[PDB]
Structure formats: C-alpha cells, structure tokens
Amino acid sequence: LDVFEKTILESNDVPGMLAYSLKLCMSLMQNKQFRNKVLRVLVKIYMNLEKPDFINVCQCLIFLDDPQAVSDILEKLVKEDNLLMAYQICFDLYESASQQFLSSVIQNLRT
Amino acid sequence: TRPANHRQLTFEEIAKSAKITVNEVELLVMKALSVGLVKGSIDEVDKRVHMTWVQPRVLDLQQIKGMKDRLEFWCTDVKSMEMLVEHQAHDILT
Amino acid sequence: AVDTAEQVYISSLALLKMLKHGRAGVPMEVMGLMLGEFVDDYTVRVIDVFAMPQSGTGVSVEAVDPVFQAKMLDMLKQTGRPEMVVGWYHSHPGFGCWLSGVDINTQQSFEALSERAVAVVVDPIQSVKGKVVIDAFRLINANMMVLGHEPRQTTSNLGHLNKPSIQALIHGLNRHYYSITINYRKNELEQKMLLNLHKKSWMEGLTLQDYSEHCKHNESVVKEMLELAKNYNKAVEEEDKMTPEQLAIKNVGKQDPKRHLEEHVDVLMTSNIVQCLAAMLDTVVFK
Amino acid sequence: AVQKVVVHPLVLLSVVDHFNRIGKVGNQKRVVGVLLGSWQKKVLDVSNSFAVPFDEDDKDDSVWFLDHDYLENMYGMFKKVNARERIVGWYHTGPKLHKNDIAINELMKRYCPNSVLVIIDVKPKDLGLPTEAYISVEEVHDDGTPTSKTFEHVTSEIGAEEAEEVGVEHLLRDIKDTTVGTLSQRITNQVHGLKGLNSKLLDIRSYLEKVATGKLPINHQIIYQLQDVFNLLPDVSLQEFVKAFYLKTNDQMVVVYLASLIRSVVALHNLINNKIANRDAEKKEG
Amino acid sequence: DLYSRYKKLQQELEFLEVQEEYIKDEQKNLKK
Amino acid sequence: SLGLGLAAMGTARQDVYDLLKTNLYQDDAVTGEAAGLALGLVMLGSKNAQAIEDMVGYAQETQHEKILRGLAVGIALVMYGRMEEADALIESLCRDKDPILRRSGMYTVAMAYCGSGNNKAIRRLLHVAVSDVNDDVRRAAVESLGFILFRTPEQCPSV
Numbered sequence: 001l002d003v004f005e006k007t008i009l010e011s012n013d014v015p016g017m018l019a020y021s022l023k024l025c026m027s028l029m030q031n032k033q034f035r036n037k038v039l040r041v042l043v044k045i046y047m048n049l050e051k052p053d054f055i056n057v058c059q060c061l062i063f064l065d066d067p068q069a070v071s072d073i074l075e076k077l078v079k080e081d082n083l084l085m086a087y088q089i090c091f092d093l094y095e096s097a098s099q100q101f102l103s104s105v106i107q108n109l110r111t
Numbered sequence: 112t113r114p115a116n117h118r119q120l121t122f123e124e125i126a127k128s129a130k131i132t133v134n135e136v137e138l139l140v141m142k143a144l145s146v147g148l149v150k151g152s153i154d155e156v157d158k159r160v161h162m163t164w165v166q167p168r169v170l171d172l173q174q175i176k177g178m179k180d181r182l183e184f185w186c187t188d189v190k191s192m193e194m195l196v197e198h199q200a201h202d203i204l205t
Numbered sequence: 206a207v208d209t210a211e212q213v214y215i216s217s218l219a220l221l222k223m224l225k226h227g228r229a230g231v232p233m234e235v236m237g238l239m240l241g242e243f244v245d246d247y248t249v250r251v252i253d254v255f256a257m258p259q260s261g262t263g264v265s266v267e268a269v270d271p272v273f274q275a276k277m278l279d280m281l282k283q284t285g286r287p288e289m290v291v292g293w294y295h296s297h298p299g300f301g302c303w304l305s306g307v308d309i310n311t312q313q314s315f316e317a318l319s320e321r322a323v324a325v326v327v328d329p330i331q332s333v334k335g336k337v338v339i340d341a342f343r344l345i346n347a348n349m350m351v352l353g354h355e356p357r358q359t360t361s362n363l364g365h366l367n368k369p370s371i372q373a374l375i376h377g378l379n380r381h382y383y384s385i386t387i388n389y390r391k392n393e394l395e396q397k398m399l400l401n402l403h404k405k406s407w408m409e410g411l412t413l414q415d416y417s418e419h420c421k422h423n424e425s426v427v428k429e430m431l432e433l434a435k436n437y438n439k440a441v442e443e444e445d446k447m448t449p450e451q452l453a454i455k456n457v458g459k460q461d462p463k464r465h466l467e468e469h470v471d472v473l474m475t476s477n478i479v480q481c482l483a484a485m486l487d488t489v490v491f492k
Numbered sequence: 493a494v495q496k497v498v499v500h501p502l503v504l505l506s507v508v509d510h511f512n513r514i515g516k517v518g519n520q521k522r523v524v525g526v527l528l529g530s531w532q533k534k535v536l537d538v539s540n541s542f543a544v545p546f547d548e549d550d551k552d553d554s555v556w557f558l559d560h561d562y563l564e565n566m567y568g569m570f571k572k573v574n575a576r577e578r579i580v581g582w583y584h585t586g587p588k589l590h591k592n593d594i595a596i597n598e599l600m601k602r603y604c605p606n607s608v609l610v611i612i613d614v615k616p617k618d619l620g621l622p623t624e625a626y627i628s629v630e631e632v633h634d635d636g637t638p639t640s641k642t643f644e645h646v647t648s649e650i651g652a653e654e655a656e657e658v659g660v661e662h663l664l665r666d667i668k669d670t671t672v673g674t675l676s677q678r679i680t681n682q683v684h685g686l687k688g689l690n691s692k693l694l695d696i697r698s699y700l701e702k703v704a705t706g707k708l709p710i711n712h713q714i715i716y717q718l719q720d721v722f723n724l725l726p727d728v729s730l731q732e733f734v735k736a737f738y739l740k741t742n743d744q745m746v747v748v749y750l751a752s753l754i755r756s757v758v759a760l761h762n763l764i765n766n767k768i769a770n771r772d773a774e775k776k777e778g
Numbered sequence: 779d780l781y782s783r784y785k786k787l788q789q790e791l792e793f794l795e796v797q798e799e800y801i802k803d804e805q806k807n808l809k810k
Numbered sequence: 811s812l813g814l815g816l817a818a819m820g821t822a823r824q825d826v827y828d829l830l831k832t833n834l835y836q837d838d839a840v841t842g843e844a845a846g847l848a849l850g851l852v853m854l855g856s857k858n859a860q861a862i863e864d865m866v867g868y869a870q871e872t873q874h875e876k877i878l879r880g881l882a883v884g885i886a887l888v889m890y891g892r893m894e895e896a897d898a899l900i901e902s903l904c905r906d907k908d909p910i911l912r913r914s915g916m917y918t919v920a921m922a923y924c925g926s927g928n929n930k931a932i933r934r935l936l937h938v939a940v941s942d943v944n945d946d947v948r949r950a951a952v953e954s955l956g957f958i959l960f961r962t963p964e965q966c967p968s969v
Contacts, residue, residue, distance in 0.1 A: 028785045032893070099820050100855075115725060164723065167716040172704060175711075178718055179700055186693055192489045193686040196678070204669065204679040212875070218509045221502045221659045228655040229574075244874070245839045258573055273569065280566055284545055285513035334661045389663075393907050395508060398616045400666055403501055403650055405621050407688065410681025420740065423747045434754075441761065467758055473751045475674040481744050483682065488737070490686075491726045665943055671809065789927075793965060796932050800940075800969075807940050 005041050018042070022056060026063065036064055047073070054089045062097040071108035122158045209357045209364035212248050213323060213341055213387045217395045219254040220327075220337070226256050227296040228329035234266045234295055235259065238274075239323065240281070241291035249321060250390075251291045253281070265307055266295075292323035299330035302340040303376035312344055323385070340373075342382045350380055357383065410483065419480055426469050433469075437462035494606065497536040497625050498651035501660050503527070504612070504623070510543040511585060511614050522548065522585045524596070526563060527610060528570065529580030536608060536625075537651075540577060542566060548592070556592050558599065579604050586611030586624065594641065597628055609643075619688045623648050635712065815848025826852050827861075834868065842876025850884030857889045862899070869911065882914035886921050896922035897930075904938060912938075913947035920954035925961040932958075 008018050022042060029035045043057040052073075061070050070093060077086035094102065113120070125136045140160065143149045151162035219239075226235055237256030244250055255277060260267050281288070293315055295308060304312065304324065315322040325341045332338060345356050359365075367386060369378055378384065413419075440462050444452075511523050525543030529536070545559050570577055581604050584593060593609065601607045606627070613622035626643035633640060652660075669676055681688075699714065727733055811833055818826045826848070834845040846865070853861055862885060869881040889896045896918055903915030916935065923931045935958075939951035959966050 024782075028789070098855075100822070103821070115723065116728065167719045169712065170715060170719075172710070175700070175703055175715075178715075178722065179703060181722060182693070182697065182700070186690075186697070189490055189686060189689055189693060192486060193683075196683050196686065200675075200678050200683065203675050204683070217663060218505060220663075221505065221656060224659050225502060225655055247839070248875070256573060276565070277569065280562060284543060284562070285510065286516075329655065329658070332658045332662075334658055337658065337662050391907075394512065395505065396666065396907070398508065398613070399501060399505065399660060400664055401616050402504060402613075402622060403652075403660060405650075406680065407620060407685070408681075410677050411685045411689070420743060423744070427747065427750070463758075463761075466754070470751045470754050470758075471673070473747055475677075477744050477748050477751075478674055479677045481741070483677075486682075486686070487726075488729070490689075492728060668810070792927075792929055796929060796936070797969070799933075800936065803937065803940055 001037055001041060004038060005045065008042070008045060018046075019056075022060070039064055054085065055092050058089050058092050059096065062093070062101065065101070067101060067105040068108050071105060074109065118162050119159050120162070122160070206356075206358050208247065208360045209383070210247065210361035211385045212363070213385050214248060214250045214390050215387060216252055216390055217392070217399075219251060220339075220389075222254045223294065223325075223327045224329050224332070224337075227327045231296075231329055232298050233261050234297065236266065236293065236295035238290055239292040239294060239325065240278075240288045242288060243291060243321075249291055249323060251323065253288060254294070255281075291319075291321070292325065294325035294327060296327050296329065298328070300328065301331065301370060301372050302326040302328060302338060302342075303373045303378060304342060304344075304382050305376070309344070309377065309381060316344060324382070339387065341385045341387060342378075343385065344382045345379075347381055411487075413484060414480055419476070423473070423477065426473055430466075430469055430473075433462055433466055437466050494531075494536050494608070494627060494646050495534050496647045496649065497538060497608070497610075499538045499610070499623055499648070500651060500653060501656055503538050503541045504650065506541050507543070507583070507585065507612055508614065514543075520548070520550075522546070522587075522590060523614075524584040525582065526567065526579065527581045527583045527608070528567075528577050530576065530578055531580060531606075536580065536646075538580060538610070540570070540574075541583065548590075553591055556596060556599075558596075563600075581606070581608035581610075583610035583612065585614055587614070601628075608646075619684060619691060621648060621650070623650065811844040811848045815851035819851045820854035820856075821852055822856050822858075823852055837872065839874035839876050842874055842878070843880040846877065846880030846882075846884040848884075849881070850887035853888045855888075855890030857892070857895065862888060866899075866903075866911075870908075875910075878908075878910050882910050883917065886914060886917035889918060889922055891924050891926075892922040893926060893928070904934070909944040909947055912942065913944070913950045916947060916950040916954055920950075920957045923958045926958055927961060928958075 008014070008021075022039075025035065025038050025042070039060050043053075043060050046053045046057055057073065058070060070089070074086065074089065077089065080086075093105075097105075122133060122136050125131070125139075126133055129136075129139075131139070137153070137155070140149075140153060144151070144153075148166045149162060150164035151160055153160050226237065229235075235256065236259065237254060239251045240253040240255060241249070241251035257273055257277075258269050260269055278290075293311075297303075303326070308324075312322070312324050321343070323341050324343055326339065328338050349356055363386060367384070369384060507523055507525065510525065514521050514523060523543055524546040525541050527538060528540040529538040531537055544562055545557070547557065549555065567579065582596065582600060584590070584596075589611065597607050597609060608628075609626055611624040611626070616622055625646055625648045627646050628641070629644055630639075630641040632638060669679065696718070702710070811830065814826055815830070830845060830849050830852075833841055834849060836845075846869075849861075849865065865881050865885045865888075869878050869885075872878065889899075900915055900919045900922070903911045903918070906912060906915075916938070919931055919935055935951065935954055939948060942948060942951070955969070956966060
C-alpha cells in the first residue's frame, strides 16, 4: 500500500498518471480484498491534493460503500458554500449509487 | 481339525489315530467314500490321501469366534481391492 | 374463453395403462376413461385411467352396460381417495392422431356435462422408443366455423410450439378441434424408483465366461480376420485411381474391409480386457 | 416347483401410486393387494394388480381383514375385461416381513394353489434388485414344531415387454449408462458388484451379533453352510494355478497385442485420408 | 505497459482454459 | 401487487412484505406471479436468509406452476452482486430434481455475478448448458452469459 502511495507522491509528473491507475484498479482487479485497500488511499491523497477532485472521490466511494464519507466532504462544501462545486459530487452520486445507499446516506445529510 | 492349507493326512497317521494296521485302512476309506460322509482322493504309493470335503458337524459358541475373526479381515480385502477401481476408473464413469 | 396455453399435466402412472391396454388389443380401437383432478381454467390434471368392456366393428367401437361404470367408481372411492372423470381416450391403431367422424360424436356427448372433457389419442405403433405420439385434443364449435371467426384468443407464447402433421391436417384439424401442448409430472416419488429398479443385475460380471471357449472364441474371430485383412491387403492397393467418391457408390454390392476391419478390433478388445481383469480380482479377493 | 418369477414395471409402479394414496394416514399402513398374472411354462408371470382395504392394530396383531366382496367383484370385472388375466397370488408392500404374512397366504389360497407373495420397496436404496418374492412350503420335520411352515425365496427379476419398453424408455429421459463398450461392465459389476459383495459379507456379520450376547436360539441349521464356505474357500496359490494363470495371460494379451497393432495402422491410413484433403485443396480453393 | 501485457495474457488463459474444456465434454454428450 | 413491489423495489419495506405473505400462502395458481415476483423486488440485494428459507421452502410442495414460476425469478433477485455469497444455494438448486428450480438456480448465479468475468461461474454455469435435459433450463443457461459478461462485449460473439 505505501510504496503504491509513494508512486503518486514522487518525482513523477501527473498529467493523467493518477487517473488510469484508478481505471486499472477497478477493471482488472482480482478481488475486493486488495481493491478497497488500494482505493481508499488514492482519494485521501486527492483530498491531500491542492485541488480536491470531486467525481473520482464519489466514484470510488460507492464502490467502497461509505455512507458517511461523502457527507463529511459535503459538509466541507457547505462550509465552502458553493453549489457549483457541491454539484458533481451529488448528481454523480444520484446517477450511479443505488436507492438503498441514497436511503442510507440521507441520515448523514440532514445531520 | 486340520486347516484348509493341507488337510492331507497319511496312512501311518491313521495307523496311529485308530491303532489299526496298514492293510485295512484302504478298505476303511473306500467305505467312507461310498457312504458319502467324506469326499477326497486316495494315493497309494506316496501313502497320503487328499481329503477335500468333510461332513458338516455342529459347534458351540467358541467355533463361531473362529468364524468371527476369519470372516472379519475378509471385509477389508473386499474393501481394499475395490478402492482401486473407484479411484483408477473414476473418470471412465462419473 | 381459453388462452391456447392449456398445459395438460398428466402423470407418470397413467400412460403405461394407456399403452398396455392400447397395444394388447391394438388393431381394434380400444378406449377408456380418464379419472383425474380438476384445477383452474387454464390447466388440468389427469391422474388415473381405466377402461371398460367394449363392443366394436371395423370402423366403429361402442361400449356396453353402464352398471360397470358406476360400480367401478364406487370401489375406487373407497380404496384410495375419490376423483372425478376429467375426460376419455381412445386408440388409433397405426394411424396418427385425429378426431374421425365417429370419434367426434361421443366427444360431443361428453363435453356437455363438463365443458373440459379432454379427448386423448394414443398410438401404440408409431411410438418406437422415444416419441410416444399422443397429442390430446378438444373440440371447437362448428358454429364459429360458419361465422368464419378464429377462436381461442392467443395470449401466451406457448401454443404454437409443436407443429401438426399434415395427415392430421387433412382431417378435422383445424376446423372442428385444436391441439394441446402437454408434458409429464415427474418426481423422486417415481422417477428415482423406475431408474434404480429396472435394469439391474447381480452376478453378471463377478463371474468368468466359459473359460475353455473364451480363448477358443479368441480364434473364431481372428481366423477370418486374416482374410478380412487380405481384403485390406487388397483395397488400398487399388487407390490412386478413379476418384474415391466413385469408391462409395460402386462398393455397395459387397462388404468393404476398412469399416469391417475396425469392427472386430472393438470386439476382440472388450471380450479380452473384461475377461482378463475380472479373473485377476478373484485371485486377490478369494484367498 | 417354480423356476422364477417375471414382474412387469407396471405392477412395479402400480403399488407406488397406491402407497401415495394411503400415504396420508401418516402413522402406519402396509399396502397389501391382490397380484394378478398368468404363470405358464413353469415360469411365474405378473401382469396387473390393485390394492384391497387393509388395516392393522398393534395390540394383538393377529387381526387382519380382506374385504372379499371387493376381491370378488373387481376380479370379476378384471376376469371380464381381461379373460386371459387371472389371479396369481398376492403381494404386500414389504419393508421388513410383517407377522400377519404367515396366514394371509393361507387365507386366500382357496383361489390360487401356489399363492405367491411379492415384497417390494417403497424407499429405494440397495445394490441388488429391490423386488423380493417367497413361496409357501410346510414341514412336519426336524426340530421346531409339529406344525411348521416357512417361506423360501424363489429368484426374482423384472421382466420387460415390447409394449412397455416403449413406455419406460420414454419415461426415463435421465442419466444413463448406455453405449456398452469396455466400460459398462467396469461400472455395472466391477465398481458396483464388488461393493455388492460387501452387504453380504456384512449381512452374515449381522447374524454374528449373538456370540454371547444376542438372541437366544443359537445355530442348529445356520452353520452347515458357514462351515462349508470356509471349506469351499478356493485353492491357494502354489500349484500350476500359478503356472496356468501366467499361461493364459501369455495367450489373452497376444490377441490384444495383435488388435492394438491393427488400431495404429488403421488411423494412419486415416491420416493420409486427411493429407489428401489438406494439400489438394489449398492450391485449388485457396 | 507490460503489466498491461500480463493482465491481458492472464485474461487469455482465464478465457482459453474453459473453451478447451467446453468442446471436450460435448464429445461424449453429443454421442449420448 | 406487481405495481406495488415495483415502486418499493429494493427497499426492504416491512409494509409491502406484510400483505405479500398472505398473498403467497393462498394456495392458488393465479396469485403465483402476483406473490413471488414482487416478493423478490422489495428485497433486492437483501439476502435475508430467513426470507430465502421462506421462499425456497414454499416452492417445493405447491401444486400449481405460476407459483413455481414467480418464485423462480423472485429467489434469483433477492441476491445481487455477491461473488461468493450465493454459491451454496447455487449448488443446492442445481443438484435438485426440480427443472424449474434448476432453471431458477441459473438466474441466481446470473445475478450474483452481474458483469463479473469470473471463471468460477463459467465452469459450471456453462457445463450444465451442455448436459441438462430440460429445454427450459438450457435457454436460461446461455442467456446468463451476457448478464455476466456485458462488461466486455468483445468476447461474447467469440463463444
């Protein structure tokens, strides 16, 4: 895990090298056991990036099923107070995620 | 009394076990084959007889123990030689 | 109305009574009753079958006294549990399956009390081992044949699956009756206990086989297998010759070596490999 | 007296459906019915059956009933509807040889002289043939009683017929072991019948449970055969039984060695029959 | 991208091993 | 009931499950698609194993066929995308004598591997497509291939 986190925090340019690695770690991934261990650290560094990407931290999350982590960063965008960038974190969540996940996350949105 | 290995007694042993001379035991065993109580064959020059079948008798609760243990290891022999067949010809029919 | 998805469930038990009574008096049209259990407007279940004493001719067959009928049903109520007559059958001998002009008439008598009396034909000649050709029918009104109106209002993708024969189409199908798709009610109650009861043996294989003659039979084949190979020492030698598609039509008067020469090789193998292996187990097992 | 019996699969099946029809009693019922058939050429035939009403109470289990009017009229119908058919005896569903079947046979022997019975199976698990039949013999003899009568098993098999072979082979449509080649014998009686000999070695192991602890009658007429089996145990491996065994292996394998030699040449002639159709079309067709 | 060459040719044996089994059991089953 | 479970699809509502119990135990043919289809819809991907035990324990003793048919789709739909968590049931229905329930076992592995390119499915999902004798189950077996392999449309025309 941490030498893979060191691939993305090294002397390496990022045009798109932190994008297709997310594609490889979802498409040709063997099991869920090595998927979630890789996928959870690839978007905390996106939060650690100077521009937090929004569609991939929601795309990974419904693969990871965290009904509280999207509400934590929804709080950050309510704290930031712009529905322009609190938008694709939300309609990508409505389009992709299931009805039960949107019925489970709603306790964390109104609280 | 003798096992199924040999059961091949000699004429001198009958001369011991029945205290009768040599020139009458052949006259004795030809009677025994004629009545039907025993089924075997008679040699004369090697002085032995190949008895094959004897008349079945009765037995108490001790000779069944002989038929208990002699029967019991014949179970695993039927087990052991068949165990090859369900293992070696297994893919030939599932 | 009906939906032409009628799906008549029968049994596993009735059809053997159908064919045995159908074949023991085969060239005459034998017939009987169908004693079953009704379910909803779509399906029907026929579980038991019995016949009657009959009197017949060449083209017609009748029944006799009705006192046989009521006394038979009383004895089947008291032994087992009661049922109800779901229909009737008959047996075209070697014809096929259709309603003839007299077969349609007693059907017309039976469709009045209950309107769902199933008419069944069994042919115990056309049935070789597989197909058992059965094809149960039921009438349609010839009054709607006069109207030119097409009945039965197809509402399921289940009717037009089996195609009728042309010979049954020469007859009243489809101007006075229709066909019904059927299957068979199968269960471990019965299916396990006809498989594991019919083709079974006990000693046919733990025994040897005519030990002085098996090796003798291992020459009764090999001796002519020499001269049959002499024909195989002949027929290949006339190749690089006239275009062996010609060597298919021409050789239909006499036997070829090539197919007959691998015929005995299977026979000369399994006769030996079985008899060699079965002898070498009795050495181990029997002392 | 009787060579063997011949049972059709219909009457095999015509008990099971009645066993379903009385299966709602739950507690206890044996199916007992009238067996119909026509024995000819000293071979017992079985064709048709039904079942007669029959009950049994456990306390004083010597009280049976056969409603003979149901036996009179329905056979009279069956004698009408098939005059070739007649009575052949009776049967019962036969799990474990119940006690009333010593005089059920004597109750209805005034119809059939050799009133044979048939024991069938309703829960099939075996490695044999799950149809059993006995015969009635009586004896004023060796030791037991002045009035002694014990049933004796005549051998049993399921006969087929050209009418019903159409039916049963349509009714199977299931897992099958057809194409009898080198392998059907390996599994019908080399995999199977060796384990068939298990439950017969283990069956006499079950009588052996009386050595000092089991039931009180001891042997007298059971051990004359068991004394014979260890006596008729086969010959040991010292004689030319060793030598004449290698003799025939040295004869039976030569035929296999010739037959396998032929198998290689035939497929090699087939190999050129594909090299005639490979090279002579790539220039022609392309 | 040889690790991408490895998945696709791990996906080959993933996909080929079943196919050679798939026609193999037809061989008896069509005969039956 | 078909409109009711459709709007309450995958919702695990107890209120729709209440009147769907008494719709199920009617012992009636015509309620067969009414009960068993909506009984799976409201429990989509729930795998509530008592309700599976209620369903597979019910479609073994009834004597109509739409009640054997509506539950055949309903018990396939209670599990969704499980990858290992259906396989004891998959072995259970495929071993059973029921041709509908063997056919129902084919749809369940088809929904336990939605888009999943697993070999462990494709060994015996497609082995029973060769060997099984009913034509109903053989049509369900080959129509389970696109539902497990729509993730790559390149390989499916090749097989």
